[PDB]
Every structure is written in C-alpha cells, then in structure tokens.
Symmetry: D2
Subunit: 115 residues, 4 copies
C-alpha cells in the first residue's frame, strides 16, 4: 500500500465517507493520464489505489471530489474539488498518505511520507 | 499597533464578526492576568488591544471565544475556545498578527510577525 | 477588485513574497485557458488580477507556485504547486479572497467571499 | 481507548515523535487538575492516556508541548504549546482523537469523535 488517501470532515468531526477520489499521472506528452480511483470507506480512508510495481516515479495529481461530498450533505461549498499535485518516488519507493481536512469554504491537505 | 487578532469562518467563508477575544499576560505567580480584550469587527479583526509601551516581553495567552460564536450560528462546536500561547520577544521592531481560522471541530492558528 | 490572492508562510510566520500565481478559466473544451497572473507583493498579496467586467461566472483555477517558493528558501517541499478550483457565482455583489497558508508538506486554502 | 492524541510535522511530512502531552480536567473549584500525560510514539500517536471508567464527563485541556519539540529540531517556534479545550462525554461516552498538525509559526488541531 504505497498510496493511501484519508479524508476528514471538520464540520462534524468525523471521517468523510464515500468521497470520490481520482488519481492521475503526468504522461510523456504533458497530459494528465488516469491512474487510479476509488471512494473512501467508513473510516474516511481509501486503500488499494495502487501497487508498488505500478506506482513508478512521476508527477501525480490526487483529486478529491469535495463538492459532491458537501452537496450530498445539503451544503453549497466554495471549491469544485481539492487537488494535490506532487512528484513521487524520485528518490526511490516511499509510502505516501495524502490527508485532507474539509470545511465548506476551506480545506487543508497534508502528506505523510515514510520509508 | 503591535498586536492584532483576525478570525475567519471556514464554514461560511467570511470574517468571524463579534467574536469575543481575551488576552492574558503570565504573572510572576504563573497565573494568567487579564491584559486586554474586545470583540472582532465586521472585517473579523480586533485592533487597538495594546500599545507599544504596554506590550513588553513576556508570555501571553490569546483566548478566542469560539464556542459562543458557533452557538450563535446553530452549529455544535467541539472546543470551549481557541487558545494561543506565545512569548513576545523584542528583537528589533515587530508587529504580531494572530490569525485563527475556525471550523466546528477544527481550528488553525497562525502568527504573522513583521516589521 | 473582485479577486485577490494572499499567501502566508507557516514556517517563518511571514507573508510569502514574490510567489508566482496563475489563474485559469475553464473553456468550452474543458481545457484550462490562461486568465491572469502575477507575483505576490511584500505583504504576500496579489491585487489587480482582473476587473468586474472580465470576471464573469465560470470555473476558475488558481495555481500558486509553492515549489519554487520553498526551493528559494532551501526547504524540500512535497507539492508541485497549490491548486484552488472553484465556480464564480453572481449572486449579488461579491469579492473573492483566496488565501493560502504554506508549509513544506502541508497547505491550507480558504475562500473569503464578501460584499 | 477513549482518548488518543496524534501529532504530525508539516515541515518534514512525518509523525512528530516524543512530543510531550499533558491532559488536565477542570475541578469543582474551577482549577485545572492534572489528569494524564504521556509522549507520542514513533507513529506520532499517544494511546493509553485513560480508561473509559476514569474519563468522566467534564471540561478537559490537552496541552501539546510544541515548543520543546521544535527547539530540539533547532527551530525557534512562535507558540509555547498547542492547547485544546473541550467538554467531553456530556452526551454519554465517546471516543476522541485529538490531532495536531505542526509548523513553526502555525498549527491546526482537529477532533474526530466517534460513538
């Protein structure tokens, strides 16, 4: 599990469940290619996006579909999604946790990277 | 104006208005003594808490009454208040902006220290 | 001045100065088209990106070049840039402040929308 | 495990290890009484602070000793500590995770509360 995404709700103080997550990888022609996708669990976590073999060095974009999450709770939020763009495995394989903390008009995102 | 407090509302994406703010200075006995207080303005700021002459080196505590703020809105909050504790140091000329971004179950606070 | 961007440095507790900022508007083809850009000022703000007349309803992307900012400081950053994607809506009178608070492996972004 | 504290480092993108944590409970005479204390592990987590039996309803203060953490890394941070003040178990027993994300001049804290 070299990539995990975790999403929390700062309004209710709870994991954000069923949040859609899309991962893309920058291609040789400078375009964002689809890499993996999924939805968070009851714990607000999304495991199994990828394997160490497939998760090669590159520039990755993690898009968390925060608007649909808020809408479904009856809230009209400011952002369309939260996006996280980063270079991965450029020094060798690492394990990445991408965490997002969501409010209707604000979010924070943090990476925890372990060897 | 060496000390300013600014509060934002992450749920509505607005300044947090009429929020009570209390500042304490730590006394020789280790107890907190009242130092300055007020309510934030329509822009979510609180100016004029102290002067250069009164704001001497020491340990200060800024308490932001977040709980009454959320209660007025109708949103169950987690925290009793937000607390920012720091030592004022002389270093050269310095202005302190204590900012706070509020969500019902999360807050962040940042110090912006400039000349 | 319907759109302003403000960037703070969480590691030094200062405005983030000379940070490049690019704004894109989403075209009919779904591609991002350049819309406005600049660098933050000594106060960490970027004013004058657009006018009321040009800032019509649509989907916008604000990209903040955080990676070059940390590189200039000497601190290894995680992210390639910070990205804020949102729909501008008409609704009554409105001013948009996109704020970003930067750390090497974390950032937060908040929209302050006022009249 | 009705109370857990987790601390992350936003400069390195890593758990904050060996961070001292002190918990107090408000006493009938309005004073902060010592309740429990400990230090975060290699995972940045602190388990075993208390038991469901001892963790009665009340107002609790969780003090995270962020200054000593930064100093030991050679950084002179702004805050003395991060403090989290909240009412607990006022609707029945809950499980509380208090998370703190640390930068030298900024921090955020979030509570995740589960039944």
């Amino acid at each position: 599990c070299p990539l995990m995404v975790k999403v929390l709700d700062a309004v209710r103080g709870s994991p954000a469940i069923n949040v859609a997550v899309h991962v893309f990888r920058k291609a040789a022609d400078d375009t964002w290619e689809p890499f993996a996708s999924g939805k968070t669990s009851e714990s607000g976590e999304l495991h199994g996006l990828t394997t160490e073999e497939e998760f090669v060095e590159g520039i990755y974009k993690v898009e968390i579909d925060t608007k649909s999450f808020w809408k479904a709770l009856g809230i009209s939020p400011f952002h369309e999604h939260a996006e996280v763009v980063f270079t991965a495995n450029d020094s060798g394989p690492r394990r990445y946790t991408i965490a997002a903390l969501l409010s209707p008009y604000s979010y924070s995102t943090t990476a925890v990277v372990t060897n």
